[PDB]
Enzyme design. Structure first.
Site, mmCIF file in Angstrom:
data_model
loop_
_atom_site.group_PDB
_atom_site.id
_atom_site.type_symbol
_atom_site.label_atom_id
_atom_site.label_comp_id
_atom_site.label_asym_id
_atom_site.label_seq_id
_atom_site.Cartn_x
_atom_site.Cartn_y
_atom_site.Cartn_z
ATOM 1 N N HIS A 168 0.826 -1.199 0.000
ATOM 2 C CA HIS A 168 0.000 0.000 0.000
ATOM 3 C C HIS A 168 0.864 1.254 0.000
ATOM 4 O O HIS A 168 0.486 2.274 -0.564
ATOM 5 C CB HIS A 168 -0.920 0.016 1.231
ATOM 6 C CG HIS A 168 -1.962 -1.059 1.215
ATOM 7 N ND1 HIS A 168 -2.101 -1.982 2.234
ATOM 8 C CD2 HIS A 168 -2.914 -1.363 0.298
ATOM 9 C CE1 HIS A 168 -3.093 -2.806 1.945
ATOM 10 N NE2 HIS A 168 -3.603 -2.451 0.778
ATOM 11 N N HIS A 214 4.875 7.030 6.632
ATOM 12 C CA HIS A 214 4.731 6.469 5.287
ATOM 13 C C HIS A 214 4.269 7.596 4.378
ATOM 14 O O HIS A 214 4.050 8.718 4.845
ATOM 15 C CB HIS A 214 3.684 5.354 5.284
ATOM 16 C CG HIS A 214 2.336 5.804 5.755
ATOM 17 N ND1 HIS A 214 1.928 5.767 7.070
ATOM 18 C CD2 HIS A 214 1.329 6.407 5.076
ATOM 19 C CE1 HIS A 214 0.709 6.350 7.153
ATOM 20 N NE2 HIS A 214 0.293 6.758 5.969
ATOM 21 N N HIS A 268 1.910 8.951 0.629
ATOM 22 C CA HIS A 268 0.829 8.787 -0.351
ATOM 23 C C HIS A 268 1.284 9.684 -1.489
ATOM 24 O O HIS A 268 1.756 10.810 -1.259
ATOM 25 C CB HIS A 268 -0.522 9.290 0.176
ATOM 26 C CG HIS A 268 -0.984 8.595 1.422
ATOM 27 N ND1 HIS A 268 -1.646 7.385 1.444
ATOM 28 C CD2 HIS A 268 -0.815 8.944 2.723
ATOM 29 C CE1 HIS A 268 -1.846 7.053 2.736
ATOM 30 N NE2 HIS A 268 -1.356 7.976 3.541
ATOM 31 N N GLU A 314 -3.416 13.456 0.228
ATOM 32 C CA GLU A 314 -4.741 13.047 0.663
ATOM 33 C C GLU A 314 -5.481 14.314 1.060
ATOM 34 O O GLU A 314 -6.602 14.568 0.604
ATOM 35 C CB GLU A 314 -4.639 12.060 1.820
ATOM 36 C CG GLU A 314 -3.888 10.799 1.429
ATOM 37 C CD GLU A 314 -4.304 9.591 2.241
ATOM 38 O OE1 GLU A 314 -4.214 9.658 3.488
ATOM 39 O OE2 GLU A 314 -4.732 8.580 1.632
ATOM 40 N N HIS A 333 2.979 11.051 6.241
ATOM 41 C CA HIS A 333 2.197 10.855 7.465
ATOM 42 C C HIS A 333 3.055 10.259 8.574
ATOM 43 O O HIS A 333 3.592 9.174 8.422
ATOM 44 C CB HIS A 333 0.996 9.937 7.184
ATOM 45 C CG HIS A 333 -0.100 10.603 6.401
ATOM 46 N ND1 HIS A 333 -1.053 9.878 5.731
ATOM 47 C CD2 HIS A 333 -0.336 11.928 6.224
ATOM 48 C CE1 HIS A 333 -1.842 10.765 5.159
ATOM 49 N NE2 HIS A 333 -1.454 12.023 5.428
ATOM 50 N N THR A 387 -6.923 6.983 7.227
ATOM 51 C CA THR A 387 -7.326 7.148 5.829
ATOM 52 C C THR A 387 -7.254 5.837 5.044
ATOM 53 O O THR A 387 -7.369 5.824 3.817
ATOM 54 C CB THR A 387 -6.501 8.207 5.072
ATOM 55 O OG1 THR A 387 -5.146 7.759 4.936
ATOM 56 C CG2 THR A 387 -6.556 9.569 5.813
ATOM 57 N N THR A 388 -7.036 4.745 5.761
ATOM 58 C CA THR A 388 -7.022 3.414 5.160
ATOM 59 C C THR A 388 -7.909 2.553 6.059
ATOM 60 O O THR A 388 -8.140 2.885 7.222
ATOM 61 C CB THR A 388 -5.641 2.740 5.193
ATOM 62 O OG1 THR A 388 -5.322 2.417 6.550
ATOM 63 C CG2 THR A 388 -4.562 3.633 4.598
HETATM 64 N N1 LIG Z 1 -2.901 7.166 6.487
HETATM 65 S S1 LIG Z 1 -2.921 7.191 8.089
HETATM 66 O O1 LIG Z 1 -4.270 7.443 8.496
HETATM 67 O O2 LIG Z 1 -1.898 8.097 8.519
HETATM 68 C C1 LIG Z 1 -2.485 5.585 8.697
HETATM 69 C C2 LIG Z 1 -2.272 5.401 10.053
HETATM 70 C C3 LIG Z 1 -1.949 4.143 10.531
HETATM 71 C C4 LIG Z 1 -1.831 3.062 9.665
HETATM 72 C C5 LIG Z 1 -1.459 1.708 10.188
HETATM 73 O O3 LIG Z 1 -0.620 1.611 11.069
HETATM 74 N N2 LIG Z 1 -2.023 0.628 9.625
HETATM 75 C C6 LIG Z 1 -1.727 -0.713 10.155
HETATM 76 C C7 LIG Z 1 -2.758 -1.150 11.183
HETATM 77 C C8 LIG Z 1 -4.166 -1.129 10.592
HETATM 78 C C9 LIG Z 1 -5.213 -1.554 11.617
HETATM 79 C C10 LIG Z 1 -5.538 -0.736 12.694
HETATM 80 C C11 LIG Z 1 -6.519 -1.108 13.596
HETATM 81 C C12 LIG Z 1 -7.190 -2.304 13.437
HETATM 82 C C13 LIG Z 1 -6.880 -3.128 12.377
HETATM 83 C C14 LIG Z 1 -5.897 -2.757 11.473
HETATM 84 C C15 LIG Z 1 -4.431 0.282 10.073
HETATM 85 C C16 LIG Z 1 -3.378 0.694 9.059
HETATM 86 C C17 LIG Z 1 -2.043 3.266 8.305
HETATM 87 C C18 LIG Z 1 -2.370 4.521 7.817
HETATM 88 ZN ZN LIG Z 2 -1.323 7.882 5.539
#
Ligand SMILES: NS(=O)(=O)c1ccc(C(=O)N2CCC(c3ccccc3)CC2)cc1
Ligand SMILES: [Zn+2]
Length: 259
Positions: free
Chosen positions: A61, A91, A93, A103, A116, A196-197
């Site tokens: 991703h 990370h 985008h 974003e 981010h 945002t994911t």
């Molecule tokens: N783009 S962002 O909003 O900054 C953002 C912030 C954190 C994460 C991140 O660490 N992952 C891994 C863990 C996953 C998860 C969390 C809770 C429950 C199940 C799975 C969410 C995405 C990705 C994007």
């Molecule tokens: Zn992000």
């Protein structure tokens, strides 16, 4: 399960995660003239250690740099935060061209990329995962990337990309100070939002910095050379891995400065 392709992209996530239609979803289009100047806010402080970075990973991703968060050395504090949040990872985008990639947008304008820095409330929660579900669990600092002059510190990261161009690969990435990717200003906008994911949990206090950093088109090209795909599958370049602006739904965006 989800992605950024035509079959699994952002416009379709709401069918798998209903909270995608929630009241505090991110990102958002920031209307500068409509932000509320908030003097009462505390000074935003990014206190980052030089050697807390662990590795760099292509997770299919994005490309993500993970950090040792066993203690409170690398934290974000101040601004809208009541206390310190530990940096877990950062990370990016980005898009296929300069006109798209970020974003968040500012007055309808997108940047070619957005950084981010994801921090969690280790004082209130026991794990990053646990914090990611709670309303006050996370704090993400967003930094816009503009393309122009080469960014000296960014080279160490863009040079490491070749090694993780395929999904699922990782490399050691020691002593990279994330402070090196911050602009000379700490002014920002802040609002209550979400991841945002997927799972798109509304657990994030967003802190979007006003000033972008700049990297060269060549450096931005190293990101666009990454692949959403594994070494075996057909090569599909990792581009446009961003979620578009979501409805504000009456949320107030605060600013630490006057436009
Ligand atoms: N783009 S962002 O909003 O900054 C953002 C912030 C954190 C994460 C991140 O660490 N992952 C891994 C863990 C996953 C998860 C969390 C809770 C429950 C199940 C799975 C969410 C995405 C990705 C994007
Ligand atoms: Zn992000």
């Amino acid at each position: 399960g989800w992605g950024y392709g035509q079959d699994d992209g952002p416009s379709h996530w709401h069918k798998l995660y209903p909270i995608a239609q929630g009241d505090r979803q991110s990102p958002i289009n920031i209307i500068s003239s409509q932000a509320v100047y908030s003097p009462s806010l505390q000074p935003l402080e990014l206190s980052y250690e030089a050697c807390m970075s662990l590795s760099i990973t292509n997770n299919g991703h994005s490309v993500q740099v993970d950090f040792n968060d066993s203690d409170d050395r690398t934290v974000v504090t101040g601004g809208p935060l009541e206390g310190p949040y530990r940096l877990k990872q950062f990370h990016f985008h980005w898009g296929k061209k300069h006109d798209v990639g970020s974003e968040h947008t500012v007055d309808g304008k997108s940047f070619p990329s957005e950084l981010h820095l994801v921090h969690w409330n280790a004082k209130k929660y026991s794990t990053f995962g646990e914090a990611a579900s709670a309303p006050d669990g996370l704090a993400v600092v967003g930094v816009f990337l503009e393309t122009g002059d080469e960014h000296p510190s960014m080279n160490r990261l863009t040079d490491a990309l070749y090694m993780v161009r395929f999904k699922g690969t990782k490399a050691q990435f020691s002593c990279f100070n994330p402070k090196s990717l911050l602009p000379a200003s700490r002014h920002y906008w802040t609002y209550p939002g979400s991841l945002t994911t997927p799972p798109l949990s509304e657990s994030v206090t967003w802190i979007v910095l006003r000033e972008p950093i700049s990297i060269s088109e060549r450096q931005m090209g190293k990101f666009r050379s990454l692949l959403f795909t594994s070494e075996d599958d057909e090569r599909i370049h990792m581009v446009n891995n961003f979620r578009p602006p979501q409805p504000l739904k009456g949320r107030v965006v605060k600013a630490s400065f006057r436009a």
